[PDB]
Amino acid sequence: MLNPIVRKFQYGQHTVTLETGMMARQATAAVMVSMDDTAVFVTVVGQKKAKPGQDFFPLTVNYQERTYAAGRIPGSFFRREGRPSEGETLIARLIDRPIRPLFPEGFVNEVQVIATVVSVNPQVNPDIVAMIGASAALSLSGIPFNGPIGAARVGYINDQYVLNPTQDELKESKLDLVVAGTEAAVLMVESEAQLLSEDQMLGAVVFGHEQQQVVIQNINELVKEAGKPRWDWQPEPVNEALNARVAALAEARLSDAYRITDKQERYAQVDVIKSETIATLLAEDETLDENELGEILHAIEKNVVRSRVLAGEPRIDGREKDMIRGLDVRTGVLPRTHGSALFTRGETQALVTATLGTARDAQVLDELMGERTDTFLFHYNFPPYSVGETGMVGSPKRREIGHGRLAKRGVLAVMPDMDKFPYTVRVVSEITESNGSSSMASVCGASLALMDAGVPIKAAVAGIAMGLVKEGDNYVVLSDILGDEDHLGDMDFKVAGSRDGISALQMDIKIEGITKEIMQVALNQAKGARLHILGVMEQAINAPRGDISEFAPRIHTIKINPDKIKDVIGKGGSVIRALTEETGTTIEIEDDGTVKIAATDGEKAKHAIRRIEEITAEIEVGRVYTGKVTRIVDFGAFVAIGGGKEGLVHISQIADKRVEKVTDYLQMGQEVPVKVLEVDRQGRIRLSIKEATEQ
Amino acid sequence: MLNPIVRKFQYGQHTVTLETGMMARQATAAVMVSMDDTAVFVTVVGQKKAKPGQDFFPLTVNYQERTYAAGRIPGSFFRREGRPSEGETLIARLIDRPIRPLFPEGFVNEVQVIATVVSVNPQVNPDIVAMIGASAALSLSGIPFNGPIGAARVGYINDQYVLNPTQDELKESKLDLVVAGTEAAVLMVESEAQLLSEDQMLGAVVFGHEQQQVVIQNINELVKEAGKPRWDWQPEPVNEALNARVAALAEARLSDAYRITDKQERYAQVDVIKSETIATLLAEDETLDENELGEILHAIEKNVVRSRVLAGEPRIDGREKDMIRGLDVRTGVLPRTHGSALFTRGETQALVTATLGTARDAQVLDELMGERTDTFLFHYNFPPYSVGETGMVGSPKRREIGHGRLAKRGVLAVMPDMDKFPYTVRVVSEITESNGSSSMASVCGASLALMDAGVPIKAAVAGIAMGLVKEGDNYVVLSDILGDEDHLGDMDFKVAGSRDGISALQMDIKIEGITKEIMQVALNQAKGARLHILGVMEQAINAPRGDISEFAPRIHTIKINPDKIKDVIGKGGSVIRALTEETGTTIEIEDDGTVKIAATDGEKAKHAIRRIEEITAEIEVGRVYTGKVTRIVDFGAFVAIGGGKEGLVHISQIADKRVEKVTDYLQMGQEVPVKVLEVDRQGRIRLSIKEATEQ
Amino acid sequence: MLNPIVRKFQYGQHTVTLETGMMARQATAAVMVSMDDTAVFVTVVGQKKAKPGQDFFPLTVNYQERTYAAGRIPGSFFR
Amino acid sequence: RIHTIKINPDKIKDVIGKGGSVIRALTEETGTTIEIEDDGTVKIAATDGEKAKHAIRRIEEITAEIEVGRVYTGKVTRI
RNA sequence: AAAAAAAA
C-alpha cells in the first residue's frame, strides 16, 4: 500500500536518516529527517501559478516546537501550545536567510515551508536537523532551486574544532558557530565566541564548509530516485528595447546627479530627472506602466552606484571606503534610571538603558532541551518614527527579535559571572533614528549603559556593519555601510567585538566565489574600524562606576553554619517568615550556608545582617554560657540560652551525675555557667551546667 | 557635533525642562520634557502628502509606559515585556481630546504622536507632563496647529486650591480636576470630587486656566528660536455654485420637513428629497462625485436644525430646552445574581448588575507610580446590536474604556469605606440600546444596582449629558442632548451627583468665547435636571437594604492560635486545597490569627469551623491511649493520640529516669499505653508511656 | 410607558418563561428566555439590504458566558 | 512513572540519615523526589525509568545491611 | 524543620 524510501548517512558521530513518500502525500514534498533520536517533519507547498501584480517574492518559513516532542504536557492554563515563542521565530530566521537568495531571479510564486519538531533527544539540538530538512524538502520538490544546502554547528573544545557538539560539551566550549553552505560557497554564518582571534573564526568557517559535503552528497543521492520532475518555469523575457529607450533619456543625467555631492541636492536632481523621463513616452502608445517604469529607473540607479563605487573614489555620502560616520557619545542622559547612554553614529541613534533587579525577577524560560533560568535580558525596540514613517507600535516584528538576539550575542561574552555579581540585569535599547545598521549601534550603547550602572563588565565592546562589492575580479570592502547601500553589498557582515578578539560574527553572502582570503581582508578591515569606535567610547567612560544608587536594589552575602540556617528555617520553615515580615527582606535557600540578603536600600540590608548574626546563638563547641534558668525540674533543668536550639540538660541531673539536688541552688531567672559538649537527642544538642562540679 | 536646545522655567513648586534637537532628528519634531526627575519623550511624525480617499482626519496618539522608568523588571512572565492597557489608553484619550479641535478644518493629512515615559519620580504623575510635551511637539513642528495648549491638575485641601499636587498631598484632597486650555479659553475639563457645590468646581477651572499661562508663554519663547518653518497648507477651495445649486433645491423643502414631529416620517421625507437632488444633478453628477453632493446635503441639514434650535423652541424630537426624556426604572429584573437594575431613559437603556466577592479577589495594579490594590471594579460593555448594527463583539475599544472610567468617577465618591464594608464589588453595565448619552445612563443604573445588592452607599447618585449652542451674542443650553443633536452643540458636558454636590464632571469645548458667566447658568440648569432624575430613581429604591438572601457570600472571622494556623498551611499550602474544595466555599489561608471562613450559607460556614477544629484541637486530658508508633525523629518519635496532632516520647521519658530501659517501645506494632503530658515551648510536646493518669 | 409580554409553559418539570418587548427594542428582535432561574438574553440583527457581490450566506452566531451570571468575579488577572 | 518498594520496618531509618541532610543529597544526586516513609513503602517519583532505576540502585546500596549488634568479619577500608 | 489561594 504505502512504501517509505530511507537513506542513512553518518554526520559526525550521529547517524542521520531521511524518510520520504510515507506522509502528507498532497503537499508538494515532505520529508521526516531524524538525527540520533531528534526528528523534525518538514514540508513545502508551492503555488503552481504566479499571483498577478506581485513584485516581491513571498516566501514563508514557519518553525514550531510541539511539546509532545519532549514527552511533557504544556504549562499554559489552556494546556495547549500558544503563538510561536521568541526562540522559535529566531530559528525560522536561521532557515530563511540561506534559502531566500538561492531561488532564481524573477521567481515570485507563493512558497511556504513548515518545520515541526516531532521528537527531541535533549542532547541533540533540533535546529541543525531542521536546516537539512528544509534543504531536502526544497530539493525533492519540483520548485526551481539552485542546489541543496547543508548546515553544521562547529564548537571549539580544548583548541580543537568539534562538529555538531552535544549540549553538555557547549558548557566548556569557547565558540558556537552555525555554517550553512552549498558545494560552491558559504551562504551564511552566525556565531557567539568568548573573544577568539580573527583567524580562529575564519578557520572554523572553512572547517564547517568541508564537513557539510556529506549532507550535500546524500541529498543529491536521494533526489536521483525519489524526487519529482522539475516543473518548467522560465523567467519572463526582459524588454531590451524598453531598457535602451529609458537609458538614453536618464543614464547620463542620473550619473550627473550622483557626481553632484550633497545629502539632499543629489536627491532633488534625481527626482526632476525621474519625473520628466517617466512622463516622456508615458502617453506614447500607453505601453508604459508604473511598475514597468519604476523598476527600470531604480535598476539604472543601482547600476550607476555599483560602477561608480568600484572605480570612482566618492561613495554616496562622500566618505572613502575606510571611513566611519562621525561619533557623538553621552552618558547618564536619563534621570532616576539605573544606567543610561545615548550613542549616535551621526544618522543612527540608540537611547539605551540598563536596569538591575533581585534574583526573583530573572526569567524562567521552559523549552524542549529543559527549563533554564537566565539573568541577562536584552530587548530591542524599533519605533516607527525612527525612519520617519507613521505606523502601529503594537508588538515587535521578527527583525526586532533578530537584532535583539544578535546584540545580546555581542555583549554576553563580556558580562560578569553570577558569583561576583548576583543581580539580574535587563538592557533595553530604544532606537530613535535609523539610517545605518542599528543593531551594531545597540552593542556600543549597551556597553556604555552597563558600565555606567557600575556592573563590573570585563571590557568595552563595539560593533561595525560592513559590505563588499565584487562585480569583477576587482573588489572593494566598504566600512560602516549606510542602510541606503544594502543593494550595493554582494556580501554583508557584522563584527561585534572587544579591544582584542571578536565576540559575535554574522555574515550573509549573495554571490559565488568568496574564497577565504576575501573574508580575511574584509574582517581585517573590520578590526581596524572597531578599534576607532572603541577609542571614542573609552574617553566617555573609561571603567565601571561603584553603584547606581538610584533606588538600586542592594544584595549582600555571608556564610552561616548549616545547622543555624536550618533553625532559621525551623518549625517547618515558618521561622524564616518571622524575619521576612519584620525586615521587608527575602532570605534565600542555600541550606548549606551561603545566606543572600536582598533589599531596596542600604538600611534594611544592614538590619538583616545585624538580625542573622544576633538571632542565632547555636554553637556546639560553645564557651561558658551565662544563660538563665527557666525550670530546674528533673529529666534535666531547662535554661534560656538564645537562638538555634535551646539545649535541655543531660538526663536526670544538673551536673556530676545529679551530685546536688533541685532544692539546692533554687531560683528562677538566675545566670548560670552552661556548656553544650553533649549528645544529640530529641534532635537537640544537650547541655550541662558546670556549677563547682562536672560530668 | 550634537548639542540640545534647553529651556527650563518654574511651574508651581517643580521646575520644567524642555529639551530639543538631541534625539529622533528624522521625526518632524521631538521634545524631551522633564519635571522634577519625571521625564517623557514625545515625538510627532506627519505625512506631507494626503491620501486621495480620506474625508475624515486620521490623528493617532499612543502613550506608552516603559517599565525601565523607575527601575523595575516587568512582572509579566512571558518575555518580561508589556502591551497597551486601560491605564495607558485613558492617558492617550486625555492627550487626544484637546488636540483634535485645535487642528484647522480640512486638515486631513495623517499625523501620529508617540509619547514614551522614560523616568518616573513616584511623587509626580507622568500624565500632566505628557500633555505639555505633546503641546510643545505639535507647536514646534510646522504642522498647522492653532496655538500651544498648557495643562494643570488642581487639588483642593482645607478649602485652598493647590496646583500639581504630589501623591502625598492628593490623598487628602477633595477634587482632582484636570484642565487644559489655550490663551483664549478652556478646551477640556476632567474631574472627580467629594460631593462639592457647583461654585467650588467652577472656581477650580478658572484657577487652573490662569496658572497654565506660564506654560503657554514659555512654549512660544522656545518656538521663537528652535521651531521649523510652518509647512504651507491651504484649505481646499469650496465652489459656491456647487453648494448653491444643491442649496436652492433643498433648504425650503427641508425647513417644512424638520417641522414633522414623527422621527420615522421625517427620516423618510429627507431621504427622498436627497435622492431627488442627486437625480436633479443629472449629467456630470456633482463634479462626478455623489459623495461631494452628499456632503453639501448633510451641511444644509446641520445648518437648518442649528438655526431652528437657537431661534425656535422645537428640537428634532419636539422637546423643549429643559425636558429630560421619559423615565422607566425596574429593579431586580435578573434572578440569582447579587443585584440588578434596568434603567431606561427614553430609548437609551442600560442593564446594570453588581456582584460581591472576598477581599482575596481584588486586582493588583502594577502602575509605574507604585503597586496598588483597588476593591471597586467597573466594566462597560457596548454590544453592536444596541445601535441596530452588526459587528465584532470580543475586544473593548478606547471609548468603552473612556466611558467605563467616567461612570466609575460618578459612583466612586459614594462607596462605603472597606473598614465598614469588607467586600470587593464589581459593577458590569450592558448598554442594550444607545440613541443618547449611554455613559450617564450607566451611572444611574449602577447606583440602583449597588443599593439593591445592599451595599450601604452614602447617597443615591445620577447623571445627565448637556449641550450648549452659541452664536455671535446669544446661546441656548439644551438638556439630555440626543446622539443626532451632538453635531449642533459647540460645547457638551456631563455631570454626575447626589441630591447635593457634583461627584464627577467632564467638558469638551469646540469654540472660543465661552466664559465663567455662561458655565454658571449651564451647571445651574444641570442641577435642575439631575434633581428630577433623582426623584424617579428614589421611588424604585429609597435606601440601601439588607444583604442578598442566599447567593451573597457571608464572611466569618474565627480566631485561632496563629502557630497552629501556620501548621494548617502545611508545606506552604498543600492540605488547605482539599479543605476549601470539600466545603466547596472560599475559606481563606490568612495566618494573622483571624481565619476567614467565607461561605454561601451558615451550614458550610459551621462545616468549615468544625473541619479546622478537627485538625487544630488536641484533647487536654483524654484517656490512657494505646498509641501506635507513627514516625522517627532524631532520637525522638510521633505517637497517635487524642486530637489532630501526635505527641513525642523521648526515649529516656517514662518516670523522668530510665527505671526500665525503654528500648522495647522503639518499634511499630508495640502500641503500649501512653497518657497526655505537657506542651513545651520547643514544640516537641512531652509524652510518657505510663498507665498512671498524667495531666 | 414600556411593558413586556410574557408566556410561561412547563417543559420537562422546569417552568420556561418567554419574555419580549422590554429590552433591545432597536435590534430586530430580543427574547429573555428563562428556565428555572437559568436565564439567557438572545437578540438577532439582520441587514435590510443585501450587499452586492455576496454569493455565500454570512450568518454569525456568538454565545457569551458573563461570569456575573454565577455570582463570581473573574479568575483572569485583568478581572 | 511512580515506583514503590517495601524495605524492612527498622532499617528504613538508616535510608534517611540525620534529618533532611542525606535526603537532599540523594534527591539531588538521583534527580528523583524520594519522600520519607516510616512504613517503608518508599515512593520514588521519577520522570523516566533511568532515574527510577538509578534511585532504586542507590537506596538498595546505602541501606543493604542488618544491624543486630552482632559480630562482622569487617575489612578496614580506611584508617 | 524545609511553612500561608493569585490563571498578564
Residue numbers in the entry:
A (entry chain C), B (entry chain B): 1 to 695
C (entry chain A): 1 to 79
D (entry chain A): 554 to 632
What wording appears in the published article?
Polynucleotide phosphorylase (PNPase) is an ancient exoribonuclease conserved in the course of evolution and is found in species as diverse as bacteria and humans. Although PNPase can catalyze the polymerization of nucleotides, its main cellular function is the 3ʹ-to-5ʹ degradation of RNA (Grunberg-Manago et al., 1955). While the catalytic core performs the phosphorolytic action, the KH and S1 domains participate in RNA substrate capture and autoregulation (Wong et al., 2013) and are powerful facilitators of PNPase activity. Cryoelectron microscopy (cryo-EM) was used to solve structures for E. coli PNPase in the apo- and substrate-bound forms and in a ternary complex with sRNA substrate and Hfq (i.e., the RNA carrier complex).
Cryo-EM studies were carried out on complexes formed between PNPase and RNA under conditions that do not support catalysis. We used the sponge RNA 3ʹETSleuZ, which was observed in vivo in pull-downs of PNPase under conditions of induced RyhB expression. Comparison of the models for PNPase-RNA and apo-PNPase shows that both KH and S1 domains clamp onto the 3ʹETSleuZ substrate. In particular, one of the three KH domains appears to be the main contact for the RNA substrate. Although density for RNA is not apparent within the active sites of the enzyme, there is visible density for three bases stacking on the three Phe77 residues at the entrance channel, where the RNA path may branch among three possible routes into the core interior. The structure of the substrate-bound enzyme in the phosphorolytic mode indicates how the flexibility of the S1 and KH domains facilitates substrate capture and how these domains clamp down on intercepted single-stranded RNA.
